[PDB]
Each structure stands twice: as structure tokens, then as C-alpha cells.
């Protein structure tokens, strides 16, 4: 059995959201590997399929429920279950395809999307850029219902993809950055619905690069600057790890410590 964290957009509040993400991060890392004060995620190679996924269950006001399956090695949303069916993003390699076999074994119907979960593919199908898709508790309620009804056939493909972009950002990207968590937390505090800033979009894109730079830095010093953006769009370069310590919450494992 895989661990199951649950969150509901029903009485969603800034606290219930902060505990949810705190719970999701708590289940991804084992706390054994930490570098420069930032927890690293399990190494894929040699990880027993019984500790390879965690399950996040979301439910909204309409009583509809959906269960997302996140890969513990990268906090990647790999699929989901809705009722008696399960849908998986198209695996991009043999190993992964073999692993999603152990997810939602109950379900009578397992479908595998023709496309992957990556943002490009998802933004293309959605007919919108991450910059135009609004985020908040309102958008999460809608995304759950949209995701739920796809099993009964009442959700067009463009909307499914717009719902995956919403969940991925509010759960997986929020667990990866305290900056993005706080961003989502502000949208809940004031009941706002608004697309992610250039700062959020950029941090999402640089997760892989940052994971690498920090882990193979020479005493917190990067070899090459990683460029990021501000809320207003202006860019700035980061040369050291210290400025990122209060911004990144999880790192994808890149290489072993000396």
C-alpha cells in the first residue's frame, strides 16, 4: 500500500493548505539526504516499487473525489484515479512504464494517455500558456470536477490538460518551492484567481538546473550562474546557494556526496 495524503477544497484555508504541502513534502523525502540545508529526493536507481509513489487525494465541495499518484523521485504527477478508472501520462521510458503497473491495481479500466505530462505538451493541448491559466482554490475545485468527469466522458481534452496544469502547479510545484507555496497561500487568503507571475514560471523551469548547480557546487558556490526572474519580470543571476535556501524545499537527486 502507498501512503495517502488528502486535501479538500471544501473548507480550504491557509492553514489546511500549509499542512497539506507540509504532509506531501514529509512523504517525498526520507530526510536522510540533505545538502546545503535543502532535502534531496530518493535516488531512482535501487528504489523498491513499494516506496516509489505516494497518493494525494483531492475532494471538493461537490463531493467529487480524485486521487493523484506522484513519483517520489521527482514529485512528478504520473497519473490519477477517478472512480473505477485510472489514467496515466504516456511514460517516456521502459522502466517508468513498468512501474506505473503497480499503481491503482484495483481499478477495472486503466488507460494510458497518448501524451506526456511535461508542460509543453500540456500547454499545447490546453490551448493556453501557464501564464493565462489562473490559480487558486476556485481553479482547484473546477480542476477536480473536470478531472473526475473525464472518466464518464464529460470533459473535453483541452480542459483536462488545463486541469493537469493547475494541479501540478498547486501540489508538485508548491511542494518544491516555499516561494510557490506562499504564492498559492496568498491566493487562498484573499480568495484570488490569478495566473502565475514570471517569477513562478521561471522557478518552475529552473528546478532541474538548480538541483544540479547546488549539488555540484564547490562549497555553495555555483560554477555558472542560474538566471531567475522577479515578480515584475526583471532578471537577476544567482551565483551562490545561500540565497536559495529559503526558496527551494526539495531537490531531485543528481549525484552522490563525496
Amino acid at each position: 500500500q502507498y501512503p495517502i495524503i488528502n486535501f479538500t477544497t471544501a473548507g480550504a484555508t491557509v492553514q489546511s493548505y500549509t499542512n497539506f504541502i507540509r504532509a506531501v513534502r514529509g512523504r517525498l523525502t526520507t530526510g536522510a539526504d540533505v545538502r546545503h540545508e535543502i532535502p534531496v529526493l530518493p535516488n531512482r536507481v535501487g528504489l523498491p516499487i513499494n516506496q516509489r509513489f505516494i497518493l494525494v487525494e483531492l475532494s471538493n465541495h461537490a463531493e467529487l473525489s480524485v486521487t493523484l499518484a506522484l513519483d517520489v523521485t521527482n514529485a512528478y504527477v504520473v497519473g490519477y484515479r477517478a472512480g473505477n478508472s485510472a489514467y496515466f501520462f504516456h511514460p517516456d521510458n521502459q522502466e517508468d512504464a513498468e512501474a506505473i503497473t503497480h499503481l491503482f491495481t484495483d481499478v477495472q479500466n486503466r488507460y494510458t494517455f497518448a501524451f506526456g505530462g511535461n508542460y509543453d505538451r500540456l500547454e499545447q493541448l490546453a490551448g493556453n500558456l501557464r501564464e493565462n491559466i489562473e490559480l487558486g482554490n476556485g481553479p482547484l475545485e473546477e480542476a477536480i470536477s473536470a478531472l473526475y468527469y473525464y472518466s464518464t466522458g464529460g470533459t473535453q481534452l483541452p480542459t483536462l490538460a488545463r486541469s493537469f496544469i493547475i494541479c501540478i502547479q498547486m501540489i508538485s510545484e508548491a511542494a518544491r518551492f516555499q516561494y510557490i507555496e506562499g504564492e498559492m497561500r496568498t491566493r487562498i487568503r484573499y480568495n484570488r484567481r490569478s495566473a502565475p507571475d514570471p517569477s513562478v514560471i521561471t522557478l518552475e523551469n529552473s528546478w532541474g538546473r538548480l538541483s544540479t548547480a547546488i549539488q555540484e557546487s564547490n562549497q555553495g558556490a555555483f560554477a555558472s550562474p542560474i538566471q531567475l526572474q522577479r515578480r515584475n519580470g526583471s532578471k537577476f543571476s544567482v551565483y551562490d546557494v545561500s540565497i536559495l535556501i529559503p526558496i527551494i524545499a526539495l531537490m531531485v537527486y543528481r549525484c552522490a556526496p563525496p
Partner: protein
Amino acid sequence: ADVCMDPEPIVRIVGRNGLCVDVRDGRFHNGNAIQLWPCKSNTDANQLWTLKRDNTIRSNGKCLTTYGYSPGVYVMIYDCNTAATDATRWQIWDNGTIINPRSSLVLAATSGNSGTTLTVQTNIYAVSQGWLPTNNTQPFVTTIVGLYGLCLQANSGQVWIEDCSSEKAEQQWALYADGSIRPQQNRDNCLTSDSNIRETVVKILSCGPASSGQRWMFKNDGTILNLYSGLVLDVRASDPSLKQIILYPLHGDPNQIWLPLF
């Protein structure tokens, strides 16, 4: 894939008051002093340092060497092979401290004046001992959001938490390489803490002393730690009304968590 391969980056070393670690008058004779000096926008090798794999910091080929293992000796440039071996060894910590493993004396700058000779003092996590390897010569300016979504704000010699007006009386702060947090509009003022006592009220005094009560660090857990005392910024009794930010031991509630919004 493999074991991590740490590289050898060429970077500037910004420290006290935003000044750079400079090799005096561009000369490299064994013994010439190392000093604080306004950062340059160019390639003068006397201000760029290569962080070697062996733990030596080199500028233009020579090693950043300490004169002796006594609190007070100065730091000089020197031939790496001639110099006493473990007097060229340094570790750069995540909390901006650059220490000489062998004497436990930290690289310091006991004066914020341009031209001040670097020395090695006893570690007390003061602003005069905080450094940062970066080609970034400018301090980072952000908004610090904390309890109840309110912003950290300063009004003359005082600092409290209040609602975020994306324009208000400077709620923008500048984070320096030396670990001091300075109010955007008045950059020679430091977020200061008088005593290291379990409840002293944090205020805004001049960065002049560059004390160990003016140097802070943003932890991964969202707190703002005062390196020297071990106490974290705390909004007094989760009450923004009281208008008082104190130093308090860590317990992790919402009144001790902050997020830098840039």
C-alpha cells in the same frame, strides 16, 4: 550518475558593507595585504578569486594566506608553495563564514572603511565576518512577508509587521553579503538586536558596529536566524498589533516563519 564533481569557480568575494575582497594596489609580491575595496566592473584579477578543489582561494595565481594563527594577524597574498601549508586552507560555510581550519579564526574586516586590511578574528558571527562568493555586487532587494500575510516594515528606528502596500513606507529590504538586513531607503542602517536575551525587541540602528546582532540568515524552515545567539525573529505573542518583533527561541509556529517575496 557518478559522485558529485565539485568545480573550481572564479568569483568575487563580497563582504562587510558590500565591499569586495581586493588585493592591494594590484601587486602580487609575497606579503602584500588583502583589503576591503569598492567592487569593480571589469576583469582585474586582483578582485577575482578561484575557489580551488584543495580548499585554497587564489587570485591571479597566488594563495590567500593568513599571517599567523592568532586573533589579529592580517591576511596577505602569497606564493602557494612557499606559504605554510595549512595557512592557505579555508572552508566557506553556508552561513557566509570563511574559516581557517587549523586556527578556527574567521576571515574578518574590523572596519567598514574602504581600504581596511583583512584579518583573522575569533568567530562571533558578526557582520564583520560574513562573506559571500558571487559576481553579484548588489544586495538583494525583497519584501519579507510573515504572520497573517503581513509585511515586515520599518519606520525610522523601529521595525514591526503591517499590511503589505506594494508602495508603502519602504517595506522593501536589501540583504547584504555580510548577512545584514538593511532598510532599502537607508542602507547604512541594520536590522539590529541589542542583547542576545530571550525577548529583546529588534530595532533599526546604524550598521556602524557591524555587530553579531546585526547578522541574520534565512533558514530552509522559513525562519530568520540570528547566527550568534541562535534565536529567531518572532512576532510578539502572534500579535501584529503590539508592533514588536522580538528575538525568541525556535518553536516553529506561524509567528516565526517568513518568506522573501521578490
